[PDB]
Amino acid sequence: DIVMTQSPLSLPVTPGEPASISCRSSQNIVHNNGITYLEWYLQKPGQSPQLLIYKVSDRFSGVPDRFSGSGSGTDFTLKISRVEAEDVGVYYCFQGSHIPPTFGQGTKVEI
């Protein structure tokens, strides 16, 4: 099973100050087709987790421009231009190219 390791595990960002979360897959994760199903999920306090980014860098529907994803092969990172109060929660990088799909440990970002 592909293991995804995120760092930091805790990220208390001062409001307004930018941020970034690292994630490294234990193996190349591009599917047999050409797609790398590496995604980022945010679970805000007590809410169902929601999709932020897919295909490593494509932002999901109503997600703000503050978020963006980058990386390839081994390393991938999530980045928030200006962390706001409502951005708090546990961020998870996810890979669905290989069965079983796996999630990272989750990074808890706090103001």
């Binding site: 679970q43 169902s48 987790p49 999709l51 669905g96 069965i99 079983p100 799909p101 440990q105």
Partner: protein
């Protein structure tokens, strides 16, 4: 509007089993995979398995293979996840989630608490 509405919180004695329902609304049920992911405070989120509403095909995580069963009732557009032989580590919020095509979990149910 697409939405997955799951069954209410469940309290279960150890050794018992629980069956969670997920009714899909606002879209065509059989066109997408329905996953089941659980949030147990110990280790974030973990994929439990999934099922294909059309053929009833399923894939289970190794961790849950010997005690989880997924099923679906296309007539009422509802997926089910039954976890048997419950233990303290199963206390968690269970979520069903539909695949959105280029992305794995498009819409999520509100989650079902099982203690």
């Amino acid at each position: 509007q697409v939405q997955l509405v799951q069954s209410g919180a469940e309290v279960k004695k150890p050794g018992a089993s629980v069956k969670v329902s997920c009714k899909a609304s606002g879209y065509t049920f059989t066109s997408y995979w329905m996953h089941w992911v659980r949030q147990a405070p110990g280790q974030g989120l973990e994929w439990m398995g999934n099922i294909y509403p059309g053929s009833g095909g399923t894939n289970y995580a190794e961790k849950f293979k010997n005690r989880v069963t997924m099923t679906r009732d296309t007539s009422i557009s509802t997926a089910y996840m039954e976890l048997s032989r419950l233990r303290s580590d199963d206390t968690a919020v269970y979520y069903c989630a539909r695949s959105g095509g280029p992305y794995f979990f498009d819409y999520w149910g509100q989650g079902t608490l099982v203690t």
